[PDB]
Design a protein around this ligand. Structure first.
Ligand SMILES: *[C@@H]1O[C@H](CO)[C@@H](O[C@@H]2O[C@H](CO)[C@@H](O[C@@H]3O[C@H](CO[C@H]4O[C@H](CO)[C@@H](O)[C@H](O)[C@@H]4O)[C@@H](O)[C@H](O[C@H]4O[C@H](CO)[C@@H](O)[C@H](O)[C@@H]4O)[C@@H]3O)[C@H](O)[C@H]2NC(C)=O)[C@H](O)[C@H]1NC(C)=O
Ligand SMILES: *[C@@H]1O[C@H](CO)[C@@H](O[C@@H]2O[C@H](CO)[C@@H](O[C@@H]3O[C@H](CO[C@H]4O[C@H](CO)[C@@H](O)[C@H](O)[C@@H]4O)[C@@H](O)[C@H](O[C@H]4O[C@H](CO)[C@@H](O)[C@H](O)[C@@H]4O)[C@@H]3O)[C@H](O)[C@H]2NC(C)=O)[C@H](O)[C@H]1NC(C)=O
Lengths: 323, 319
């Protein structure tokens, strides 16, 4: 009887702290699905949006009377809980989905504002040829002043107009992002840019500066490799790229396939680390699919770096299929 | 044959923003025990709470009973740091567990981390240790007390202790504790307790073996081709992936000898796009080495590998 149809609701409980207020070594998240009309159900856990493998959780369904109830328990290390990740319990039931999320409760006193200033990316500098720098202001407490953000150059020369975006975050904080276009010649010849930040709730101004990294230059070497085919990887293959011996550390790494620049999200790429000698190195890992290599069996690891010649780029291709 | 009751308390979680709900539920679970007389009483700071504040119920499944009691608290009361005790009396014997609001994880901007043993130290060296690290504490007066304990309450050995004033003017305290190889593998919980005169209260971290699924690493090793201008050097790269849990040790061997840790680097474990973790390890080698013997071994030590927690792959510079 339709009038008796009962939709699931979703609630997450967590392992309690002890009598001292301390976390247990492991945290259980228990996703409870309230009594609902019987019918196929599936529970999926997400970590910061990413599907977690079902291995990490267990699910149990009970029916008592005319209502079904389901719970799923996810177990996490204290370390991971304390890293402030967000976990989502996703329930799919007869069509649409229901969900709930949780993370470590926020600390008592939200701390103060901080600001970060980034250099242009090599990609923007050399490929797009529209370099910008970004001043990011975080941990703002809303409904106060406005947070003044002013750009200037060491030379005293004029700055271009910047864009400004304010975003309310889930944890209740505010971030303010200002992006400033910089002259290409200006940047490359060593101009210094300053972001100056002020707010009523701030005692003295925050001042951040950025300029091209000085010192020795060296071009990157690029090497792309495929893991072998084996029973555990018949319709997917893992590619890897090692980029090394470059200086300074500023580099942009992308994977290209079939005239498309793949989304950054597709690969896991390390931040530059010093070699055992001179220069830096980065590793990139990219999992590809059969559909991709059957479309075009060519995957290109490309590095953009000021010291690569002729055109600030070095790349290597890898194929996974004999043809 | 007889299964005694155990007690555990769960509670309403904070939302995706880390915000508290309007009310807090505490749920005391006594799961899977031999049926018998049972009572669940809640205490607030040691005093029995009114009967109308909680509702207890019991069900039977096969040879076991399961009991639970739900207590609802105002956010205000939870946030006031009162302690709540679930007091279970089963066949005239009392079992208790207690909870209060989780304390700040980063008081005064301080952070504290606690590691698990390295698989190399645990399985090869047979002398596992864990390390408690505390960062960003003020160089004010008073000493930083860093004490170790086991959840079981069994003895611990002495530990190392090192404090260093950092370039940014902050202070970090490090302590390393030797643990029982068997004690650790069997699931002991180790606790690092930090007290700073400037800190409001003791800060604790706890660690124990993974309880998740296990999966052995796949190891693949590659040699860079010669790069123009670099005739007498090559780089070896080792991709180790799809292992679980994430704890892993990597070594390289050449001419049957394990190379010094300083010869190579390994990335921090990170998730693959599906199950498990991966790391990359990198080893620069010289013509003199590969001409002496052209075989280099990338070896992973991991609890899921067998027979002896080890899986490896050799690579050569030349065909
Ligand atoms: C003032 O200057 C000091 C300089 O020392 C800074 O202190 C550093 O702060 C960082 C960040 O807090 C510390 O990094 C943390 O290290 C933990 C322990 O790892 C050590 O031990 C393991 C295991 O043996 C080694 O593998 C590792 O190399 C270290 O030796 C980690 O467990 C922490 O992990 C967390 O952060 C990482 C970031 O990569 C995340 O990926 C994890 O998910 C997790 O959240 C963390 O990495 C570091 O130890 C400190 N350096 C030193 C030398 O002590 C201060 O931060 C700085 N203060 C200010 C205000 O700038
Ligand atoms: C409430 O919620 C928000 C998130 O919604 C949190 O805001 C984050 O706060 C952290 C720390 O304050 C911010 O981390 C900083 O990010 C900078 C920018 O990152 C991007 O841009 C750079 C430059 O283009 C890229 O390199 C990078 O890949 C990102 O795309 C970094 O530049 C900063 O790095 C510095 O600190 C880190 C510490 O991790 C060091 O490792 C670095 O070496 C360097 O010193 C820094 O990481 C983060 O950007 C914020 N996220 C936002 C705004 O979206 C709040 O922290 C949270 N509040 C509470 C109470 O937790």
């Amino acid at each position: 009887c339709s009038r008796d149809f009962t939709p699931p609701t979703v609630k997450i409980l967590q392992s309690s702290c002890d009598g001292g207020g301390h976390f247990p070594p492991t945290i259980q998240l228990l996703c409870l699905v309230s009594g609902y009309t019987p019918g196929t159900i599936q529970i999926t856990w997400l970590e910061d949006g990413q599907v977690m493998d079902v291995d990490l959780s267990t699910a149990s369904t009970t029916q008592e009377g005319e209502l079904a109830s389901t719970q799923s328990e996810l177990t996490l290390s204290q370390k991971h809980w304390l890293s402030d990740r967000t976990y989502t319990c996703q329930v799919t039931y007869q069509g649409h989905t229901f969900e709930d999320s949780t993370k470590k409760c926020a600390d008592s006193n939200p701390r103060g504002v901080s600001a970060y200033l980034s250099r242009p990316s090599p990609f923007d500098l050399f490929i797009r040829k529209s370099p910008t720098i970004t001043c990011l202001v975080v941990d703002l407490a809303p409904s106060k002043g406005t947070v003044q953000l002013t750009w200037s150059r060491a030379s005293g020369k004029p700055v271009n107009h910047s864009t400004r975006k304010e975003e309310k975050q889930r944890n209740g904080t505010l971030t303010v992002t200002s992006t400033l276009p910089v002259g290409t010649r200006d940047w490359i010849e060593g101009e210094t840019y300053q972001c100056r930040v002020t707010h009523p709730h701030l005692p003295r101004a925050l001042m951040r500066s950025t300029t091209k990294t000085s010192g020795p230059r060296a071009a990157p070497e690029v090497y792309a490799f495929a893991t072998p085919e084996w029973p555990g990887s018949r319709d997917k293959r893992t590619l890897a790229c090692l980029i090394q011996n470059f200086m300074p550390e500023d580099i942009s790494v992308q994977w290209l396939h079939n005239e498309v620049q793949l989304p950054d999200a597709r690969h896991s790429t390390t931040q530059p680390r010093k070699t055992k000698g001179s220069g830096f190195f980065v590793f990139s890992r990219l999992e590809v699919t059969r559909a991709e290599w059957e479309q075009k069996d060519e995957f290109i690891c490309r590095a953009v770096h000021e010291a690569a010649s002729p055109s600030q780029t070095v790349q290597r291709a890898v194929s996974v299929n004999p043809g």
